[PDB]
Amino acid sequence: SQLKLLVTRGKEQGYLTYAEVNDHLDQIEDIIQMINDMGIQVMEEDAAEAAAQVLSSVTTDPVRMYMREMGTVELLTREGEIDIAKRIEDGINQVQCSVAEYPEAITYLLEQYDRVEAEEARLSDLITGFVDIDPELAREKFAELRAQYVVTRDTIKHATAQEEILKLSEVFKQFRLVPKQFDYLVNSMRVMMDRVRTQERLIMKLCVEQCKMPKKNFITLFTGNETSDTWFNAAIAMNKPWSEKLHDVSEEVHRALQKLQQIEEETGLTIEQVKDINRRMSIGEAKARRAKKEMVEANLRLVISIAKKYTNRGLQFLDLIQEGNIGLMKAVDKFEYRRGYKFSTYATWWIRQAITRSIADQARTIRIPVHMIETINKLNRISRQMLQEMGREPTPEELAERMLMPEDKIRKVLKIAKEPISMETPIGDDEDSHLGDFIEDTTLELPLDSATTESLRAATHDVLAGLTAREAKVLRMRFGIDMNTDYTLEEVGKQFDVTRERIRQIEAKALRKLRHPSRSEVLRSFLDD
Amino acid sequence: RRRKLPATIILRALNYTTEQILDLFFEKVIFEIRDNKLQMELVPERLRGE
Amino acid sequence: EFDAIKIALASPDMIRSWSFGEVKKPETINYRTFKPERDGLFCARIFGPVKDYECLCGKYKRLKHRGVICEKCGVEVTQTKVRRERMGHIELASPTAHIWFLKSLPSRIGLLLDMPLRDIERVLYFESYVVIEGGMTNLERQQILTEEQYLDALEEFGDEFDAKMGAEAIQALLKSMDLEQECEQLREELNETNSETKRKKLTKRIKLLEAFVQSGNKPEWMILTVLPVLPPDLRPLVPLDGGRFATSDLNDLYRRVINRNNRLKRLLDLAAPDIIVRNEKRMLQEAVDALLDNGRRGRAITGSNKRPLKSLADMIKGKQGRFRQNLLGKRVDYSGRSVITVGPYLRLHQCGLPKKMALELFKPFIYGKLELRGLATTIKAAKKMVEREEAVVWDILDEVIREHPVLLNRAPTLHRLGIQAFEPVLIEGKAIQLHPLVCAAYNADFDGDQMAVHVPLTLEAQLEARALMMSTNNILSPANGEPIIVPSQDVVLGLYYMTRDCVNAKGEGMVLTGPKEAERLYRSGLASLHARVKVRITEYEKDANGELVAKTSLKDTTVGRAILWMIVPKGLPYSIVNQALGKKAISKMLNTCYRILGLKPTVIFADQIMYTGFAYAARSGASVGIDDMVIPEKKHEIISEAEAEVAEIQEQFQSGLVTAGERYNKVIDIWAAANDRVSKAMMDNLQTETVINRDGQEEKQVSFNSIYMMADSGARGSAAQIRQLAGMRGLMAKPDGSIIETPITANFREGLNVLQYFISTHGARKGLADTALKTANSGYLTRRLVDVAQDLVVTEDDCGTHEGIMMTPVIEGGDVKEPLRDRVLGRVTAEDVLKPGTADILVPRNTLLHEQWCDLLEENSVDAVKVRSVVSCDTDFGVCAHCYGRDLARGHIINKGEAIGVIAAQSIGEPGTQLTMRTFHISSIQVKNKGSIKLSNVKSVVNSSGKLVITSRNTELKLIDEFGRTKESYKVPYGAVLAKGDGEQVAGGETVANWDPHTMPVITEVSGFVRFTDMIDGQTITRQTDELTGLSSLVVLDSAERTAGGKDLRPALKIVDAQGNDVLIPGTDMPAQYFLPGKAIVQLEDGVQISSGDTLARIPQDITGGLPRVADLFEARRPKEPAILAEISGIVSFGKETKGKRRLVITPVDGSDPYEEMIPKWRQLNVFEGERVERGDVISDGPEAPHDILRLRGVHAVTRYIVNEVQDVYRLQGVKINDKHIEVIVRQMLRKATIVNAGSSDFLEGEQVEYSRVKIANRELEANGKVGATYSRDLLGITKASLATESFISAASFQETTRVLTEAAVAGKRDELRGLKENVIVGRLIPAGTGYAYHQDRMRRRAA
Ligand SMILES: [Mg+2]
Ligand SMILES: [Zn+2]
Ligand SMILES: [Zn+2]
C-alpha cells in the first residue's frame, strides 16, 4: 500500500507537493494530475475511490512510444541490404512471370503496343525502356511477342504450348515497362481473381456454406474436373439429403459455371492455371513486399537523424518524422543496388525533399508556393551574408542590386512572411484581455445608418405616395424598390406594355417632376455634400 | 527534488564507516570495565539539566 | 421561441446533418488574394459567402440572386453572417477516441466497459490487443495480451481470435456489447453480492448503464469517426493593419489534425508498414485529443509562441471562457463611467450628471425628440446638429432626462445597494455628483473613485429602476433592517457640535417662545449656538388611532437642540434631539423616524438632517490644531516607572530567576499596563480638561478639543487612535505575531526616530499587504454562496405548516447578548404566544411580529415564541412568503417573487469584508445578580451533605426572574456541589455549584457501605497507600495498569448495605456496584460505611472569528476533534476491550442495542457504562460536528447550531447581520437526502436524492392508497451542495465544465429553464423578480 498510503495521506493533510509525490512513489506528471482530484489539492513546493482505483492499477508521449517501438530495430548489414534488395527483385520477378504466366496479359500487352503503333501513346512512353536506344528494336521485339504468341496458338491441343507461352515470357522478363501499364493488367489481374473467386462464393459458398455440404464433397468433386458440370451438376445424385438440397440452386450455381466457363474463356486456359499464377504472384509479392518492409525498418535511424535539424521551423516533431518515412518508403521502390551502393546515401535525398517539400506545404496558417518559399529562403539567406558583410543591414534597394529583381517584386515577398498572431495572445494591463478582445467588426450596419434607411424607404415611399400610378409604379419598376426587382428598361417596356423607348420618356418624366425643389425636398434631407 | 534517502547514505558513499561517522557527529561517553559495576567517566557540564 | 434545453451524445449521422460539406484540405486562404481556399478551413461552398449577397467567383453580385448557388464557384449566395452559422464536418481516416469520455475523472468509457483506464490506454495507443470474438480458447472480450501472446494466439490458429488494437478495437467493443444483457446480468450478480462496497459500486455502475439504456445513446457514438468543425467566423482569420494577420488557435489545431488525417489516408493507399501507420493513428488520436481539450493529454502542444495553444473546451470553461466571463459579464451600450465627487446640495432622489456624458448616453433619445419636434429633417441631420451642439439640443435634453432615471454603479458591487437609480441633473464639468448619504451604501470615498451610469432603455426598465431600485425606496439595508442612509462622516460632527451643553455662554438660561425664536436669537448674535436654555416646544406624540395629539411644555435644553428640532417631523418626541446626539444616537433617530412615521417623511428628514448638519459644521469652523493634541504631563513619569520595571526584570534575569522566554512576557505585560495607564491619563487630561466659571466658581464639562470632538462624536476615529496621537503608541508587533519588546515610547505629536519608524513599518507593511488581498477575494464567499442558493425564490404565499424554531435570547450567564426583540422582529409566529398566566393567547397563528407585537411581548416578558423558520417551510421548489418573514429593505411582509436566495447570499457575504480576513484565534456557577434558580434536567438526589449535587449530565442553570422569563443561565457539570436546591428565591453574588477538574466524581445515588467487588491487587489493581501520611486506597487501574490476570474483570466499589446484598439502583434491573474506569481515584477502603450521595471516587479530567472560519463553517467540515453521541436513548454499558479502541453499547429500555463502533480512549469518555443517556447526549469529546447534530438532534438543531455558530463570528466582530439569511443558506445545505425504505418508491433504499422528489412523492402516495416511504436527511457543504443541481447549464457556468458536460451529455439530460443562472444565459427573463408573471404564464402555456 504505497500510493494507497500516499492518497490516505492526501485525505489526511489535504495538500501534497512535489516532495512527497516524487518520494512516495512522464508518468510522474500523469500521476500528479491524477492525484489532483480525490479531491486532494496537490501542488508544487465519484473520484476519491475512482482516482484511488486508477491509482491502484500498478508514458504516452508518442515520441517515447515511438522510440520504444523502434527498440527492436537495428542497423542492417550492407550486403545484407543487397540480399533484401535481391529478395525484392525476386518478388518483382515472380509478379512479372505471373503476369507472363497469364497469356492474355501479353495479349493486352500487344493491344497497348498496337495502340502506340496506331499512335495511342508514345513509343518511348509505352515502356520505361527494355532491359538492354531506338524503339524499332524494342517495338519489333514487342512485335516478336506478337509472332512469338501466334506460334504458341498452335499447341493447346498442350505439350508444345506450355513452353511456348513462356518463351514470350522469358523475353518478357528482360523488359522494364512503365508501372501504369504494369499495374493495369495487374489491377486487371487483381480484377481477374476477384471475379473468379466471387464465382465460387456463388459456386461453393452456396453449396458448402449453406446446404450442409461437407468440405470433402466439393473438393473431391470440383478440384479434379473443376470446369464442367461433372463436379457440380453430378453432385445432385450423391445419395445424400443435402445433395438433395443441391436442386434449388442447381440452375443458379450452374450459372456460376456459366460465369466460370466465361472466366476460363476470359483466362483462355484453365482457372487453376490462372489461380496458381496470381496465387504464386501474391505469394512472392507479399514476400516481395515483406522484403521491402524489412528494409524500411532498418533505416528510420537515418530519418530521425535527418529530421533532427528541421524541427523548430513550426512543425511538430512527429510530423517531420512521418513525412520523413514517406520518402523512406517511396525510395524502397526506387533504390537500386544494381549499381552497387549504400541505401544510406540514397535515402536522404528522398527524405530531405520529403521534409522540405512538406515543410513549405503544411507549416503555416497561410499557405505559400514552394517557389515563393523558394524566394523567401533565398532572401533570408542572402539577407544574412549582406547584413553581416556590408555593416548595418540590407535595405530592399540594396537587395535590388544583390538580387537584381525589381524591388517591388521583392518588397511584396517581404510583406508575405510573418504568419498571423495568436488572437488568444495576452495583452498587457494584467487584465487578461486577449488580443482578439479588441478586434472590431466591419460587417455591422451602423445602428444609426439602419435608423436612417428605415426613413428612406419610408420617405421615398412618401414622394412615391404622391406620384401617378404609372410614375409611382414605373419608378418602383425602374429601380430596385420593395421587391426582388430591378427589371431592365426593356423588361419594364413589356410589363407596362408601352415601349422600350417610351418608358424612359415617362421615366425621364418621372423624376423631372420629382426634380422639383419645394416638391421633393424630403430626399433633399438625404443629401450632404 | 529527487527520492529521499537516509541522510548518512551519502556519507557511507563519502568513504565513511560506523566508527568515525558516529565520532564526527556525536561526542564520546566512554564506559569501561573497572572491575566493579562498570565504573564510568563523566563530564560535569556534559550532563547538566536532566 | 424555445424551451427545455437539451443535450446528448452526437451520432455521426447527426454530425453529417449539421455540416454543409466536409473540409479536406489544410489550406486556408489564397495569400495573394485573401479569398478562402477551395475546401480548406475557410470555404466558399461549405461555410457560404464572404460578403453580403455575392458569390466568391464574382459571377453573381446582386441581392436579386438570393439563394441560387453559383455553378463555377458553387458558393450559396446569402447573407455574409451565415458563415457564423454553418458548420463543417470531417471524415476521419480512422476512428479515434473522444478525450472527454476517455481521460475525464470518472472515466465515462472507463466504467462503461468494466476496464481500468490504463488498460484502455494501452489499447488506444497501439500497445496491446484487446480480444473480441476471441474464440473458446482463452478469452471472450476483456483480457489484454502482448505480442508474444498475440503471436502465440495467432500461433496454432488464425481463425477464432478476431481482435484489434486501438480505436477500431474499442469501437467493436462498444458496437458489440448490449446494455440490457449486462444490466440484467450484474443485476443478478448484485443482490447476491450486495456487500457494503460491492453493493454500492455495482449499483451505481448499473445505474450508469441503465442511464445509457433509456437515453437511446450508443456507446460506439463515444468513439469518434466523424469530427465536426466550428464555423469559420467563430475562429476567424481577421486582417491586422500592416500586412499581418490574427487567427485563433482553433485554426492551426484544425490544420494539424487535417494534416495528420491526410497523411494517414496517403499511408492507407500505400499499404505501408503497420508500424508507421500505427504511429500515424496514434498521432491523430493525439491531435484530436489535444483539439477537444489541452489538460488531460500530457503536454499542451504549443506553437511558435512560447505559450500553449488554446483549444476548444478552454473557450467554454475557466474565468476567461465564454460561460464565466462573457456570457454573464458583458459590456453594455448606453453606459458610461466617470469620476465621482460630492456635490452635497442635491437631494437623495437624484444625482448630478456631466453634460457631455448625458448627451452621449441619451443620444438616440435626443435624435427621436429632434425628429418629433421637426427641429431637424432626418436622423442624419439630427446627428450632425447635435454634434454642432446648438442651443435647442440643451432644452431637448433637459426635457428628455426629466423623469428618466439612470443607474449608478461601482466596481465592487457587493450587495444590491451597490446599484441604485437616480434622477439626473445636468451639470457642467466632467465629474459625477452623488448624495453623500449614499456613499456609505456604495462604500466609496472620493479619493478618485469611479462609478458608471447605465441608461434604462425599456419603459418596463424605467419603471423597474424607479419603483424597485431608486435610492429613496432603498434606504434600509437588506442584511438587517437598520437604515443605511445614516449621516456618514461630517454631518454627524456638525450635529454633535450643535447639540452640546456648555455651562456658560451668551444668553445662558433664558426662556424662548419656540424653536424659531431660538434660531432668530442665535443668528442675530445674542445667544451662543449651544447655551443651556429653558425653551417652549410642542411635540406631536401621536397616541390615538393615527391621532397626532400635540402637547407643549417648557423643555430645558440647548439653543442648538431647539434649532435642530425644527427639522424633526411631527412624529418623534423631543427626547431624541435632547442629548449630545453623537453618531450612534442620530442613527437611532433615523431608525425611530422610519419606525414611527413611515418612509417619505423619513427620507425628507434625512435630507434635512444632512443639510442642517453640513451647514452647522460649516459654522463650527471645527479645525484640528497642533496645540489640540495634548500630551499628558504625567507621561514621562509612567515611562520612567516602566523603564525601572524593565531594568528590574533584567536585573533578576541576570540573577538567574526567570527564563528569557518569560522575561519577554513580563516586559510585554509591563509595557502593556503602562500603555493602558498612559491612555487613561491622556483621556482624563483631554476628555474633560475644559473648566469654565459661570457665576464665579469653575465647573467641569466635556472638552471642546476638536479631536476629542471628532472621537466622542464618533464621526471619524475613536479613543484608541487619539491615544496613538498623544500617548505612547503600542508595542508594534512583528508581521507574524511576535511582539517586539521595546515599544515606541514616542507619539505622533512628537517625532519618531529612525528605529521607532522602522519598528512601525513591520505592522504597517503587513496590514497594507493583507488589506490589498481581501480585494483579491472581495467576492469569493459571496460567489460561493450565490451559486448554491441562487435557485431559491419565494414562490407561494403560505404553506400552512406549524414548524419552526423556539426563539430564545443568546445569553451565556453574563448579560443578554441578544434579546428576544431582535431575534423575533419581523418573523411570523407559527402558533399562539401564551403569557405565563397560561390562558393569554397573544398572537394567534399568522401575526407578523412587527415592532408593536414584539413591543407588547417586551413589556409582557414572554420568551417562548415558536416562529416558523424558512428551513422548515413545507413549500416545494421555494419558500412560503409567510414563512420567510419581512426583513426587506421595505418594512412590510415579503412578497412572492423576491429572490431571497440572492439577497441572503449578499447579506451573509458583504459584511464578511467587514470581518477580519484571516482566521484569528482567542470554576463554579456564581449567581451574578438577584433572582431564583431553575435546574433544567435536574436529575439529582439529596447527597452526603444532605444537599443537592448533579447526578444527571445536562443540568443547565437559570437565573429565574419573577417576570416569566430566564434572566441568566449556567451549565452545571456532573457531580457539581450544588450549595442549594431548585426553586430557591436566592440573593445575589453566590456560588451555588462547585466541582474540580481533578475530581469528576462517581458519587453514590443512595447509601451503602464500602464493600468492593473484583478490586483485586496484582490481578486488577494496585493496593495504593499514599504513605506521606499513610493512607491506603484501591484506585482503579486501566488495562495497561491492570495485569492480564484481571483485565477481563470490571472493577467497582459495590454499593451494599449493612446486611450483605448489593443494593440495586431503583429504576434498573442491576444491583448498584459503581463500575469504574481507569484512573478512578478511590479512597474508601473495604468495609467503610457511607450514605446517600457521598463522594465515592472523584476522578480527574477559545473561539475563532475570521472570515475563512465562516466559509469552513458553511461547509460542515469534520473538525479535528469530533464529538459522537448516542444513537439510542437508554442505559449504556461497556463491551469488548481495546481492539485498537474501547467498545461499549447504549442499551435501550426494551429494544436492542446493536450500536457499537471503534471508540478510541485517546478521546475521553464523559459518561460511564451505567447511565440512561438519550440520543444526542455527550459521550465523545471536543467540538461536535454539525452533521451529527442533524442526524441525531434533527434539522432544527443543526440549523440552530449553525446560525448560532456563524452569527457569533459576526457577533464577536461587532458586525450586525440578520439571522433570516443564515437560514436560507442552511436550507440549501440540506436539500439532498437519502432513503430509509423504498416502500412505494422508485429508487434504491440505500440511495441519495434531493428532498423535493421524496417530498412530493411520499406525500402524494399517501393520497394514493399506497404506502409512504421514509428517508434519511443528508447534509452537504455549500460547494458540495451546489454541485448537486437539477440543471446542467447552471452547473457549467460555475463548476468544472467538462465534469458537468460529459455527465449531462451521457445522461441525455434535459434542462427546462428554471432558476436564475440559466435564464440569464439564454437571455430570457428571470423566473424570480418582475419576471415572475412572465414565467408562471408559461406554466399555463405548459399546462394544456
Ligand atoms: Mg475608494
Ligand atoms: Zn458564383
Ligand atoms: Zn415558507
TrEMBL record, chain A:
Chain positions recorded as Mg(2+) binding sites: 521, 524
Claim: Lipoprotein is one of the keywords in the record:
no
> An example Gene Ontology cellular component term from the record?
cytoplasm
A Pfam family cross-referenced in the UniProt record is Sigma70_ner
Q: Which domain of life is it from?
A: Bacteria
Chain spans, region Sigma-70 factor domain-4: 463-516
Name it.
Answer: RNA polymerase sigma factor RpoD
- List the source organism: Escherichia coli
Gene responsible for this protein: rpoD
